[PDB]
Amino acid sequence: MNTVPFTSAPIEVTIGIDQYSFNVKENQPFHGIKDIPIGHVHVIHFQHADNSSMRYGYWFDCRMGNFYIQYDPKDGLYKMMEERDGAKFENIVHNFKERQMMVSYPKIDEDDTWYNLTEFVQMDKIRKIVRKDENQFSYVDSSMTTVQENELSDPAHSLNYTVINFKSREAIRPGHEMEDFLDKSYYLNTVMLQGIFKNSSNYFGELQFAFLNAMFFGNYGSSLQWHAMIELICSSATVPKHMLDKLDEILYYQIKTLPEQYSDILLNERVWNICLYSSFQKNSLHNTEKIMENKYPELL
Amino acid sequence: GAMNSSNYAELFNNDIKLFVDDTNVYRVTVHKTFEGNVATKAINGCIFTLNPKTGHLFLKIIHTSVWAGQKRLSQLAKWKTAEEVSALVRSLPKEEQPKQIIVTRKAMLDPLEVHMLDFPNIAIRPTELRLPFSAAMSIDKLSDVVMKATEPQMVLFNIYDDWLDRISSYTAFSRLTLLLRALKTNEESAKMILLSDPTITIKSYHLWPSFTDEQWITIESQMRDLILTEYGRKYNV
Numbered sequence: 212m213n214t215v216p217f218t219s220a221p222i223e224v225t226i227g228i229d230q231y232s233f234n235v236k237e238n239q240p241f242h243g244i245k246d247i248p249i250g251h252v253h254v255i256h257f258q259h260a261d262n263s264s265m266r267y268g269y270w271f272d273c274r275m276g277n278f279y280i281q282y283d284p285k286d287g288l289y290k291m292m293e294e295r296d297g298a299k300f301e302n303i304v305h306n307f308k309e310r311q312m313m314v315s316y317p318k319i320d321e322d323d324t325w326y327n328l329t330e331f332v333q334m335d336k337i338r339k340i341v342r343k344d345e346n347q348f349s350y351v352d353s354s355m356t357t358v359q360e361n362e363l364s365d366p367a368h369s370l371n372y373t374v375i376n377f378k379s380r381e382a383i384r385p386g387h388e389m390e391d392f393l394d395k396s397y398y399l400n401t402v403m404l405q406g407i408f409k410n411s412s413n414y415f416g417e418l419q420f421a422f423l424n425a426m427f428f429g430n431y432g433s434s435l436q437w438h439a440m441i442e443l444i445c446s447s448a449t450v451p452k453h454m455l456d457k458l459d460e461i462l463y464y465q466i467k468t469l470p471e472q473y474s475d476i477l478l479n480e481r482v483w484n485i486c487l488y489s490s491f492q493k494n495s496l497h498n499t500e501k502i503m504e505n506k507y508p509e510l511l
Numbered sequence: 512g513a514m515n516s517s518n519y520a521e522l523f524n525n526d527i528k529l530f531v532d533d534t535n536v537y538r539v540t541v542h543k544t545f546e547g548n549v550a551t552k553a554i555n556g557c558i559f560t561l562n563p564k565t566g567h568l569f570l571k572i573i574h575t576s577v578w579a580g581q582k583r584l585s586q587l588a589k590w591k592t593a594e595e596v597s598a599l600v601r602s603l604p605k606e607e608q609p610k611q612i613i614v615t616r617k618a619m620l621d622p623l624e625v626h627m628l629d630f631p632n633i634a635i636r637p638t639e640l641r642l643p644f645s646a647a648m649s650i651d652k653l654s655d656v657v658m659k660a661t662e663p664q665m666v667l668f669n670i671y672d673d674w675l676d677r678i679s680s681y682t683a684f685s686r687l688t689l690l691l692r693a694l695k696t697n698e699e700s701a702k703m704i705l706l707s708d709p710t711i712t713i714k715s716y717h718l719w720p721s722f723t724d725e726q727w728i729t730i731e732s733q734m735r736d737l738i739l740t741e742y743g744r745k746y747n748v
Protein backbone atom coordinates (compact mmCIF):
# COMPACT_ATOMS: atom_id res chain seq x y z
CA MET A 212 0.00 0.00 0.00
CA ASN A 213 1.95 3.11 -1.25
CA THR A 214 1.56 6.89 -0.69
CA VAL A 215 1.84 10.10 -2.76
CA PRO A 216 1.80 12.93 -0.16
CA PHE A 217 1.24 16.65 -1.08
CA THR A 218 3.17 19.62 0.45
CA SER A 219 -0.19 21.53 0.33
CA ALA A 220 -3.14 22.46 -2.00
CA PRO A 221 -2.59 26.23 -2.55
CA ILE A 222 -5.18 26.45 -5.40
CA GLU A 223 -8.69 25.00 -5.99
CA VAL A 224 -8.31 21.83 -8.15
CA THR A 225 -10.02 18.53 -9.10
CA ILE A 226 -7.44 15.74 -8.40
CA GLY A 227 -7.55 12.43 -10.27
CA ILE A 228 -5.83 9.10 -9.38
CA ASP A 229 -6.44 6.25 -11.88
CA GLN A 230 -10.28 6.23 -12.62
CA TYR A 231 -11.10 8.19 -9.39
CA SER A 232 -11.15 11.98 -8.62
CA PHE A 233 -12.12 14.47 -5.84
CA ASN A 234 -12.39 18.32 -5.44
CA VAL A 235 -9.86 20.02 -3.10
CA LYS A 236 -10.82 23.60 -1.97
CA GLU A 237 -8.07 26.37 -2.05
CA ASN A 238 -5.96 25.96 1.21
CA GLN A 239 -8.14 23.04 2.45
CA PRO A 240 -5.64 21.03 4.57
CA PHE A 241 -5.00 18.16 2.05
CA HIS A 242 -1.67 16.18 2.22
CA GLY A 243 -2.07 13.35 -0.29
CA ILE A 244 -3.20 9.82 -1.35
CA LYS A 245 -2.44 6.58 0.65
CA ASP A 246 -3.27 2.88 -0.04
CA ILE A 247 -2.30 2.88 -3.75
CA PRO A 248 -2.09 -0.76 -4.88
CA ILE A 249 1.57 -1.77 -5.44
CA GLY A 250 2.05 -3.82 -8.65
CA HIS A 251 0.44 -1.61 -11.29
CA VAL A 252 1.41 1.69 -12.98
CA HIS A 253 -0.74 4.66 -11.79
CA VAL A 254 -1.57 8.16 -13.05
CA ILE A 255 -2.30 11.25 -10.89
CA HIS A 256 -3.88 14.18 -12.86
CA PHE A 257 -5.12 17.76 -12.27
CA GLN A 258 -7.64 20.21 -13.72
CA HIS A 259 -7.66 23.57 -11.82
CA ALA A 260 -11.02 25.23 -10.96
CA ASP A 261 -9.85 28.34 -12.99
CA ASN A 262 -9.04 27.13 -16.60
CA SER A 263 -9.64 23.69 -18.26
CA SER A 264 -6.73 23.90 -20.77
CA MET A 265 -4.61 22.90 -17.69
CA ARG A 266 -5.33 19.11 -17.80
CA TYR A 267 -2.00 17.55 -16.79
CA GLY A 268 -0.73 14.46 -14.95
CA TYR A 269 2.07 11.95 -14.13
CA TRP A 270 2.35 8.19 -14.87
CA PHE A 271 4.28 6.46 -12.05
CA ASP A 272 4.96 3.11 -10.30
CA CYS A 273 5.84 3.60 -6.54
CA ARG A 274 8.06 0.51 -6.90
CA MET A 275 10.58 2.86 -8.65
CA GLY A 276 11.03 5.52 -5.87
CA ASN A 277 9.38 7.88 -3.35
CA PHE A 278 7.18 10.41 -5.21
CA TYR A 279 5.37 13.47 -3.74
CA ILE A 280 3.46 16.42 -5.30
CA GLN A 281 4.50 20.07 -4.60
CA TYR A 282 2.70 23.07 -6.20
CA ASP A 283 5.29 25.31 -7.96
CA PRO A 284 3.89 28.91 -8.02
CA LYS A 285 6.20 30.03 -10.95
CA ASP A 286 5.31 27.29 -13.55
CA GLY A 287 1.88 27.56 -11.70
CA LEU A 288 1.04 23.82 -11.50
CA TYR A 289 1.16 20.67 -9.28
CA LYS A 290 4.62 19.04 -9.90
CA MET A 291 5.68 15.42 -9.10
CA MET A 292 9.13 15.02 -7.44
CA GLU A 293 11.28 12.13 -6.08
CA GLU A 294 12.57 12.04 -2.45
CA ARG A 295 15.92 10.08 -2.58
CA ASP A 296 16.03 10.21 1.35
CA GLY A 297 13.93 7.11 2.31
CA ALA A 298 14.13 8.18 6.02
CA LYS A 299 12.81 11.79 5.59
CA PHE A 300 10.07 10.37 3.26
CA GLU A 301 8.63 7.51 5.46
CA ASN A 302 8.88 10.10 8.33
CA ILE A 303 6.64 12.79 6.62
CA VAL A 304 4.19 10.05 5.27
CA HIS A 305 3.60 8.52 8.83
CA ASN A 306 3.11 12.08 10.28
CA PHE A 307 0.33 12.97 7.68
CA LYS A 308 -1.59 9.61 8.07
CA GLU A 309 -1.62 9.94 11.95
CA ARG A 310 -2.90 13.53 11.38
CA GLN A 311 -5.40 11.90 8.81
CA MET A 312 -4.89 14.50 6.00
CA MET A 313 -4.76 11.81 3.24
CA VAL A 314 -7.62 10.38 1.11
CA SER A 315 -7.55 6.57 0.62
CA TYR A 316 -7.23 5.00 -2.89
CA PRO A 317 -10.91 3.95 -2.81
CA LYS A 318 -10.72 0.29 -4.07
CA ILE A 319 -13.83 -1.96 -3.97
CA ASP A 320 -12.16 -5.42 -3.74
CA GLU A 321 -14.19 -7.30 -6.46
CA ASP A 322 -13.32 -4.39 -8.85
CA ASP A 323 -10.56 -5.35 -11.43
CA THR A 324 -11.15 -2.27 -13.73
CA TRP A 325 -7.74 -0.63 -13.28
CA TYR A 326 -5.93 -3.97 -13.69
CA ASN A 327 -7.98 -4.63 -16.87
CA LEU A 328 -7.15 -1.13 -18.34
CA THR A 329 -3.36 -1.41 -17.41
CA GLU A 330 -2.70 -5.22 -17.74
CA PHE A 331 0.13 -4.70 -20.34
CA VAL A 332 1.25 -1.06 -19.57
CA GLN A 333 4.83 -1.09 -18.09
CA MET A 334 6.50 2.22 -16.91
CA ASP A 335 9.67 1.45 -18.94
CA LYS A 336 7.62 1.43 -22.27
CA ILE A 337 5.96 4.70 -21.00
CA ARG A 338 9.43 6.35 -20.43
CA LYS A 339 10.28 5.47 -24.14
CA ILE A 340 7.12 7.40 -25.29
CA VAL A 341 7.47 10.43 -22.92
CA ARG A 342 11.30 10.73 -23.28
CA LYS A 343 12.66 12.49 -20.12
CA ASP A 344 14.96 9.83 -18.60
CA GLU A 345 16.06 12.14 -15.64
CA ASN A 346 12.66 11.30 -13.94
CA GLN A 347 11.34 7.78 -13.02
CA PHE A 348 7.81 9.30 -13.66
CA SER A 349 6.33 10.68 -16.98
CA TYR A 350 4.40 13.99 -17.54
CA VAL A 351 1.38 14.18 -19.99
CA ASP A 352 -1.24 16.94 -20.79
CA SER A 353 -4.07 17.78 -23.32
CA SER A 354 -1.74 19.58 -25.88
CA MET A 355 1.32 17.32 -26.20
CA THR A 356 1.53 16.35 -29.93
CA THR A 357 2.58 12.90 -31.28
CA VAL A 358 5.80 12.37 -33.41
CA GLN A 359 3.28 11.49 -36.24
CA GLU A 360 1.47 14.85 -35.49
CA ASN A 361 4.85 16.78 -35.78
CA GLU A 362 5.30 15.24 -39.33
CA LEU A 363 1.65 16.12 -40.37
CA SER A 364 6.74 21.03 -33.55
CA ASP A 365 8.81 20.93 -30.22
CA PRO A 366 10.51 17.44 -30.18
CA ALA A 367 11.20 17.40 -26.33
CA HIS A 368 7.42 17.57 -25.42
CA SER A 369 6.27 14.84 -27.94
CA LEU A 370 4.43 11.49 -27.47
CA ASN A 371 6.78 9.09 -29.38
CA TYR A 372 4.02 6.51 -30.22
CA THR A 373 4.83 3.80 -32.82
CA VAL A 374 4.04 5.25 -36.31
CA ILE A 375 1.22 3.29 -38.02
CA ASN A 376 0.34 4.44 -41.59
CA PHE A 377 -1.81 2.22 -43.86
CA LYS A 378 -0.39 4.14 -46.93
CA SER A 379 3.40 3.74 -46.40
CA ARG A 380 6.18 1.54 -47.82
CA GLU A 381 6.40 -0.15 -44.32
CA ALA A 382 2.72 -1.37 -44.68
CA ILE A 383 2.80 -2.29 -48.45
CA ARG A 384 4.96 -4.98 -50.12
CA PRO A 385 5.60 -3.87 -53.76
CA GLY A 386 3.61 -6.24 -56.05
CA HIS A 387 1.07 -6.84 -53.16
CA GLU A 388 -0.41 -3.22 -53.12
CA MET A 389 -4.07 -4.45 -53.30
CA GLU A 390 -3.51 -7.60 -51.13
CA ASP A 391 -1.63 -5.73 -48.35
CA PHE A 392 -4.05 -2.70 -48.19
CA LEU A 393 -7.31 -4.77 -48.00
CA ASP A 394 -5.61 -7.38 -45.68
CA LYS A 395 -3.03 -5.73 -43.34
CA SER A 396 -1.90 -9.16 -41.90
CA TYR A 397 1.72 -8.45 -43.16
CA TYR A 398 1.83 -4.95 -41.61
CA LEU A 399 0.43 -6.40 -38.27
CA ASN A 400 2.19 -9.84 -37.98
CA THR A 401 5.68 -9.54 -39.69
CA VAL A 402 6.30 -5.79 -39.57
CA MET A 403 4.74 -4.70 -36.30
CA LEU A 404 4.37 -7.69 -33.91
CA GLN A 405 7.59 -9.59 -34.99
CA GLY A 406 9.36 -6.47 -36.41
CA ILE A 407 8.93 -3.54 -33.91
CA PHE A 408 6.92 -4.49 -30.74
CA LYS A 409 8.37 -8.10 -30.51
CA ASN A 410 5.27 -9.62 -28.74
CA SER A 411 1.46 -8.90 -28.54
CA SER A 412 1.86 -7.66 -24.91
CA ASN A 413 3.95 -4.54 -25.88
CA TYR A 414 1.39 -3.72 -28.66
CA PHE A 415 -1.53 -4.02 -26.21
CA GLY A 416 0.43 -1.95 -23.68
CA GLU A 417 0.69 0.87 -26.21
CA LEU A 418 -2.93 0.54 -27.32
CA GLN A 419 -3.90 0.65 -23.58
CA PHE A 420 -1.59 3.60 -22.75
CA ALA A 421 -2.92 5.51 -25.81
CA PHE A 422 -6.55 5.10 -24.65
CA LEU A 423 -5.95 6.29 -21.05
CA ASN A 424 -4.01 9.40 -22.28
CA ALA A 425 -7.03 10.05 -24.61
CA MET A 426 -9.66 9.59 -21.84
CA PHE A 427 -7.77 11.27 -18.91
CA PHE A 428 -6.32 14.24 -20.89
CA GLY A 429 -8.60 14.54 -23.98
CA ASN A 430 -5.31 14.13 -25.95
CA TYR A 431 -6.33 13.99 -29.64
CA GLY A 432 -3.11 12.25 -30.76
CA SER A 433 -3.36 9.39 -28.19
CA SER A 434 -6.95 8.80 -29.53
CA LEU A 435 -5.69 8.72 -33.16
CA GLN A 436 -3.06 6.13 -31.97
CA TRP A 437 -5.71 4.09 -30.07
CA HIS A 438 -8.01 3.90 -33.12
CA ALA A 439 -5.09 3.02 -35.41
CA MET A 440 -3.84 0.02 -33.31
CA ILE A 441 -7.47 -1.28 -33.14
CA GLU A 442 -8.03 -0.74 -36.95
CA LEU A 443 -4.80 -2.59 -37.86
CA ILE A 444 -5.95 -5.71 -35.96
CA CYS A 445 -9.59 -5.41 -37.25
CA SER A 446 -8.26 -4.93 -40.82
CA SER A 447 -6.19 -8.25 -40.74
CA ALA A 448 -7.53 -11.65 -41.97
CA THR A 449 -4.84 -13.51 -39.91
CA VAL A 450 -4.50 -12.71 -36.12
CA PRO A 451 -3.33 -15.01 -33.26
CA LYS A 452 -6.57 -16.57 -31.78
CA HIS A 453 -5.26 -15.35 -28.32
CA MET A 454 -4.84 -11.73 -29.51
CA LEU A 455 -8.46 -11.54 -30.76
CA ASP A 456 -9.59 -12.98 -27.38
CA LYS A 457 -7.44 -10.52 -25.37
CA LEU A 458 -8.41 -7.38 -27.47
CA ASP A 459 -12.17 -8.07 -27.03
CA GLU A 460 -11.37 -8.04 -23.24
CA ILE A 461 -9.26 -4.83 -23.43
CA LEU A 462 -11.89 -2.96 -25.54
CA TYR A 463 -14.80 -4.14 -23.28
CA TYR A 464 -13.16 -2.45 -20.25
CA GLN A 465 -12.24 0.65 -22.29
CA ILE A 466 -15.88 1.13 -23.61
CA LYS A 467 -17.10 0.26 -20.04
CA THR A 468 -14.86 2.94 -18.38
CA LEU A 469 -15.60 5.75 -20.96
CA PRO A 470 -17.80 8.59 -19.60
CA GLU A 471 -21.16 8.36 -21.51
CA GLN A 472 -21.05 12.14 -22.40
CA TYR A 473 -17.56 12.06 -24.18
CA SER A 474 -18.59 9.26 -26.64
CA ASP A 475 -18.84 11.87 -29.48
CA ILE A 476 -15.14 13.13 -29.22
CA LEU A 477 -13.34 9.87 -28.15
CA LEU A 478 -14.98 7.36 -30.59
CA ASN A 479 -14.32 7.14 -34.37
CA GLU A 480 -17.67 6.08 -35.94
CA ARG A 481 -15.76 4.73 -38.97
CA VAL A 482 -13.20 2.50 -37.19
CA TRP A 483 -15.89 0.97 -34.94
CA ASN A 484 -18.42 0.23 -37.77
CA ILE A 485 -15.43 -1.30 -39.67
CA CYS A 486 -14.28 -3.44 -36.66
CA LEU A 487 -17.72 -4.75 -35.49
CA TYR A 488 -19.59 -4.96 -38.92
CA SER A 489 -17.29 -4.64 -42.14
CA SER A 490 -13.82 -6.04 -41.18
CA PHE A 491 -12.50 -9.63 -40.87
CA GLN A 492 -13.11 -9.42 -37.06
CA LYS A 493 -16.91 -8.58 -37.23
CA ASN A 494 -17.64 -12.00 -35.61
CA SER A 495 -14.72 -11.95 -33.15
CA LEU A 496 -15.28 -9.15 -30.52
CA HIS A 497 -18.49 -10.47 -28.89
CA ASN A 498 -18.06 -8.66 -25.54
CA THR A 499 -17.09 -5.41 -27.36
CA GLU A 500 -20.07 -5.62 -29.84
CA LYS A 501 -22.53 -6.26 -26.91
CA ILE A 502 -21.44 -3.28 -24.69
CA MET A 503 -21.09 -0.97 -27.78
CA GLU A 504 -24.68 -1.79 -29.08
CA ASN A 505 -26.16 -1.52 -25.52
CA LYS A 506 -24.25 1.67 -24.39
CA TYR A 507 -23.68 3.58 -27.74
CA PRO A 508 -26.27 2.25 -30.25
CA GLU A 509 -26.47 5.77 -31.84
CA LEU A 510 -22.91 5.40 -33.29
CA LEU A 511 -23.98 2.34 -35.44
CA GLY B 512 -8.05 18.83 -52.76
CA ALA B 513 -10.95 18.36 -55.23
CA MET B 514 -11.05 19.82 -58.81
CA ASN B 515 -14.41 21.73 -59.13
CA SER B 516 -15.98 24.79 -60.94
CA SER B 517 -13.55 27.20 -59.03
CA ASN B 518 -10.09 25.60 -59.92
CA TYR B 519 -10.88 24.72 -63.60
CA ALA B 520 -8.30 26.86 -65.55
CA GLU B 521 -5.49 24.96 -63.60
CA LEU B 522 -6.03 22.08 -66.10
CA PHE B 523 -4.45 24.44 -68.69
CA ASN B 524 -1.36 25.86 -66.85
CA ASN B 525 2.22 24.47 -67.36
CA ASP B 526 2.05 22.00 -64.41
CA ILE B 527 2.03 18.53 -66.00
CA LYS B 528 -1.14 16.69 -64.94
CA LEU B 529 -3.02 13.54 -66.16
CA PHE B 530 -6.72 12.67 -65.86
CA VAL B 531 -7.46 8.97 -65.27
CA ASP B 532 -10.94 7.59 -66.09
CA ASP B 533 -11.39 3.90 -65.09
CA THR B 534 -15.08 3.46 -66.20
CA ASN B 535 -14.18 1.30 -69.30
CA VAL B 536 -11.47 -0.83 -67.62
CA TYR B 537 -13.91 -3.64 -66.69
CA ARG B 538 -16.71 -4.24 -69.25
CA VAL B 539 -19.13 -7.20 -69.47
CA THR B 540 -22.20 -8.53 -71.36
CA VAL B 541 -24.97 -10.17 -69.29
CA HIS B 542 -26.66 -13.34 -70.66
CA LYS B 543 -29.07 -16.14 -69.62
CA THR B 544 -27.27 -19.58 -69.27
CA PHE B 545 -28.74 -22.97 -70.40
CA GLU B 546 -30.20 -23.66 -66.88
CA GLY B 547 -31.76 -20.09 -67.02
CA ASN B 548 -29.35 -18.35 -64.54
CA VAL B 549 -27.44 -15.14 -65.45
CA ALA B 550 -23.71 -14.98 -66.25
CA THR B 551 -21.35 -12.20 -67.44
CA LYS B 552 -18.86 -12.29 -70.35
CA ALA B 553 -15.89 -9.85 -69.90
CA ILE B 554 -14.85 -7.91 -73.03
CA ASN B 555 -11.75 -5.85 -73.87
CA GLY B 556 -11.39 -2.70 -71.72
CA CYS B 557 -9.24 0.44 -71.67
CA ILE B 558 -7.78 2.89 -69.09
CA PHE B 559 -8.34 6.53 -70.22
CA THR B 560 -5.23 8.63 -69.24
CA LEU B 561 -5.24 12.20 -70.63
CA ASN B 562 -2.97 15.24 -70.45
CA PRO B 563 -5.57 18.04 -70.88
CA LYS B 564 -2.83 20.58 -71.82
CA THR B 565 -1.25 18.65 -74.77
CA GLY B 566 -4.22 16.30 -75.64
CA HIS B 567 -1.86 13.26 -75.43
CA LEU B 568 -4.00 10.11 -74.72
CA PHE B 569 -2.25 7.07 -73.12
CA LEU B 570 -4.91 4.41 -73.88
CA LYS B 571 -3.89 1.23 -72.04
CA ILE B 572 -5.96 -1.63 -73.63
CA ILE B 573 -7.08 -4.19 -70.98
CA HIS B 574 -7.37 -7.75 -72.47
CA THR B 575 -10.08 -10.15 -71.09
CA SER B 576 -7.13 -12.47 -70.09
CA VAL B 577 -6.23 -10.21 -67.08
CA TRP B 578 -9.56 -11.22 -65.36
CA ALA B 579 -8.94 -15.06 -65.66
CA GLY B 580 -9.03 -16.78 -62.23
CA GLN B 581 -9.70 -13.57 -60.22
CA LYS B 582 -12.54 -12.68 -57.74
CA ARG B 583 -14.12 -9.21 -57.05
CA LEU B 584 -13.32 -8.08 -60.67
CA SER B 585 -15.03 -4.59 -60.25
CA GLN B 586 -12.71 -4.10 -57.20
CA LEU B 587 -9.67 -5.66 -59.01
CA ALA B 588 -10.27 -3.31 -62.05
CA LYS B 589 -9.45 -0.25 -59.78
CA TRP B 590 -6.11 -1.79 -58.47
CA LYS B 591 -5.14 -2.93 -62.06
CA THR B 592 -5.97 0.64 -63.22
CA ALA B 593 -3.68 2.06 -60.45
CA GLU B 594 -0.83 -0.43 -61.33
CA GLU B 595 -1.06 0.57 -65.06
CA VAL B 596 -1.00 4.36 -64.26
CA SER B 597 1.99 3.77 -61.86
CA ALA B 598 3.90 1.86 -64.64
CA LEU B 599 3.22 4.68 -67.16
CA VAL B 600 4.52 7.34 -64.67
CA ARG B 601 7.61 5.15 -63.90
CA SER B 602 8.38 4.70 -67.69
CA LEU B 603 8.47 8.54 -68.29
CA PRO B 604 11.55 10.75 -67.70
CA LYS B 605 11.47 12.65 -64.32
CA GLU B 606 10.85 16.02 -66.12
CA GLU B 607 7.70 14.49 -67.81
CA GLN B 608 6.18 12.85 -64.69
CA PRO B 609 2.98 14.63 -63.71
CA LYS B 610 2.70 16.78 -60.50
CA GLN B 611 -1.05 15.89 -60.22
CA ILE B 612 -3.18 12.88 -61.23
CA ILE B 613 -6.92 13.73 -61.17
CA VAL B 614 -9.12 10.56 -61.01
CA THR B 615 -12.76 10.86 -62.21
CA ARG B 616 -14.17 8.44 -59.53
CA LYS B 617 -13.34 8.83 -55.78
CA ALA B 618 -12.98 4.99 -55.56
CA MET B 619 -9.61 5.32 -57.50
CA LEU B 620 -8.08 7.62 -54.79
CA ASP B 621 -6.96 4.75 -52.49
CA PRO B 622 -5.71 2.30 -55.21
CA LEU B 623 -3.74 5.00 -57.02
CA GLU B 624 -2.38 6.62 -53.80
CA VAL B 625 -1.11 3.17 -52.58
CA HIS B 626 0.49 2.38 -56.00
CA MET B 627 2.16 5.85 -56.20
CA LEU B 628 3.82 5.70 -52.67
CA ASP B 629 7.17 5.98 -54.64
CA PHE B 630 5.97 9.43 -55.90
CA PRO B 631 5.44 11.40 -52.64
CA ASN B 632 5.40 14.78 -54.56
CA ILE B 633 2.62 13.60 -57.04
CA ALA B 634 -0.73 14.66 -55.64
CA ILE B 635 -3.68 12.29 -56.36
CA ARG B 636 -6.82 14.58 -56.56
CA PRO B 637 -10.52 13.79 -57.07
CA THR B 638 -12.88 16.05 -59.06
CA GLU B 639 -16.45 17.33 -58.38
CA LEU B 640 -17.00 17.75 -62.18
CA ARG B 641 -19.31 15.19 -63.85
CA LEU B 642 -16.78 14.67 -66.75
CA PRO B 643 -18.05 12.51 -69.70
CA PHE B 644 -14.86 10.42 -70.36
CA SER B 645 -16.90 7.07 -70.24
CA ALA B 646 -18.15 8.07 -73.78
CA ALA B 647 -14.51 7.50 -74.97
CA MET B 648 -15.61 4.01 -76.27
CA SER B 649 -18.16 5.76 -78.64
CA ILE B 650 -15.19 7.10 -80.66
CA ASP B 651 -15.05 4.60 -83.58
CA LYS B 652 -11.22 4.41 -83.81
CA LEU B 653 -10.84 3.91 -79.99
CA SER B 654 -13.56 1.24 -79.78
CA ASP B 655 -12.10 -0.57 -82.86
CA VAL B 656 -8.49 -0.68 -81.48
CA VAL B 657 -9.79 -1.87 -78.07
CA MET B 658 -12.14 -4.62 -79.39
CA LYS B 659 -9.65 -5.89 -82.11
CA ALA B 660 -6.73 -6.35 -79.62
CA THR B 661 -5.52 -9.92 -78.79
CA GLU B 662 -3.07 -9.01 -75.90
CA PRO B 663 -2.44 -6.18 -73.37
CA GLN B 664 -1.24 -3.17 -75.44
CA MET B 665 -0.63 0.64 -75.04
CA VAL B 666 -2.05 2.88 -77.88
CA LEU B 667 -1.23 6.65 -78.30
CA PHE B 668 -3.43 9.38 -79.85
CA ASN B 669 -3.92 13.15 -79.65
CA ILE B 670 -7.64 13.40 -78.71
CA TYR B 671 -7.49 17.11 -79.82
CA ASP B 672 -6.21 15.93 -83.28
CA ASP B 673 -4.30 19.05 -84.59
CA TRP B 674 -6.75 21.72 -83.15
CA LEU B 675 -3.98 23.11 -80.79
CA ASP B 676 -2.44 24.44 -84.09
CA ARG B 677 -5.49 26.89 -84.29
CA ILE B 678 -7.09 27.06 -80.71
CA SER B 679 -5.99 26.90 -77.01
CA SER B 680 -6.19 23.83 -74.65
CA TYR B 681 -9.09 25.50 -72.74
CA THR B 682 -11.12 25.67 -76.05
CA ALA B 683 -9.79 22.23 -77.22
CA PHE B 684 -10.92 20.68 -73.88
CA SER B 685 -14.40 22.36 -74.15
CA ARG B 686 -14.79 21.02 -77.74
CA LEU B 687 -13.80 17.58 -76.38
CA THR B 688 -16.17 17.50 -73.34
CA LEU B 689 -19.00 18.93 -75.56
CA LEU B 690 -18.40 16.14 -78.20
CA LEU B 691 -18.26 13.47 -75.42
CA ARG B 692 -21.41 14.77 -73.62
CA ALA B 693 -23.34 14.54 -76.97
CA LEU B 694 -21.93 11.05 -77.59
CA LYS B 695 -22.86 9.97 -74.03
CA THR B 696 -26.46 11.41 -74.11
CA ASN B 697 -27.33 10.02 -77.62
CA GLU B 698 -24.55 8.13 -79.44
CA GLU B 699 -26.66 7.45 -82.64
CA SER B 700 -27.69 11.13 -82.95
CA ALA B 701 -24.21 12.61 -82.10
CA LYS B 702 -22.48 10.31 -84.69
CA MET B 703 -25.09 11.18 -87.41
CA ILE B 704 -24.27 14.93 -86.79
CA LEU B 705 -20.47 14.24 -87.04
CA LEU B 706 -20.38 12.13 -90.30
CA SER B 707 -23.44 13.37 -92.37
CA ASP B 708 -21.13 15.35 -94.79
CA PRO B 709 -19.12 12.47 -96.30
CA THR B 710 -16.64 14.84 -98.05
CA ILE B 711 -15.15 15.96 -94.61
CA THR B 712 -13.04 12.92 -93.53
CA ILE B 713 -10.93 11.62 -90.57
CA LYS B 714 -7.10 11.79 -91.11
CA SER B 715 -5.42 8.37 -90.31
CA TYR B 716 -3.69 9.68 -87.06
CA HIS B 717 -6.90 11.58 -86.02
CA LEU B 718 -10.12 10.62 -84.24
CA TRP B 719 -12.44 13.46 -85.43
CA PRO B 720 -13.20 14.77 -88.95
CA SER B 721 -10.96 17.53 -90.43
CA PHE B 722 -13.60 20.32 -89.98
CA THR B 723 -12.83 24.05 -90.78
CA ASP B 724 -13.25 26.73 -88.01
CA GLU B 725 -16.64 27.66 -89.66
CA GLN B 726 -17.64 23.94 -89.73
CA TRP B 727 -16.67 23.41 -85.99
CA ILE B 728 -19.07 26.35 -85.05
CA THR B 729 -21.87 24.50 -86.98
CA ILE B 730 -21.06 21.17 -85.21
CA GLU B 731 -20.65 22.67 -81.68
CA SER B 732 -24.15 24.34 -81.92
CA GLN B 733 -25.72 21.07 -83.31
CA MET B 734 -24.12 19.10 -80.37
CA ARG B 735 -25.47 21.70 -77.85
CA ASP B 736 -29.00 21.59 -79.65
CA LEU B 737 -28.72 17.73 -79.38
CA ILE B 738 -27.78 17.82 -75.62
CA LEU B 739 -30.78 20.13 -74.85
CA THR B 740 -33.36 18.13 -76.97
CA GLU B 741 -32.49 14.84 -75.12
CA TYR B 742 -32.65 16.66 -71.68
CA GLY B 743 -36.17 18.20 -72.00
CA ARG B 744 -37.30 14.92 -73.71
CA LYS B 745 -36.07 12.94 -70.57
CA TYR B 746 -37.47 15.34 -67.86
CA ASN B 747 -40.58 16.08 -70.12
CA VAL B 748 -39.76 19.89 -69.81
Ligand SMILES: COc1cccc(C(=O)N2CCCC2)c1
Pocket residue numbers: 567568569667668669716717
Ligand atom coordinates in the same frame (compact mmCIF):
# COMPACT_ATOMS: atom_id res chain seq x y z
C1 LIG C 1 2.07 10.51 -76.12
O1 LIG C 1 1.14 10.58 -77.20
C2 LIG C 1 1.46 11.27 -78.34
C3 LIG C 1 2.65 11.99 -78.43
C4 LIG C 1 2.95 12.70 -79.59
C5 LIG C 1 2.08 12.68 -80.67
C6 LIG C 1 0.89 11.97 -80.59
C7 LIG C 1 -0.08 11.93 -81.75
O2 LIG C 1 -0.62 12.96 -82.12
N1 LIG C 1 -0.33 10.75 -82.31
C8 LIG C 1 0.46 9.56 -82.03
C9 LIG C 1 -0.05 8.52 -83.02
C10 LIG C 1 -1.30 9.07 -83.65
C11 LIG C 1 -1.43 10.53 -83.25
C12 LIG C 1 0.59 11.27 -79.43
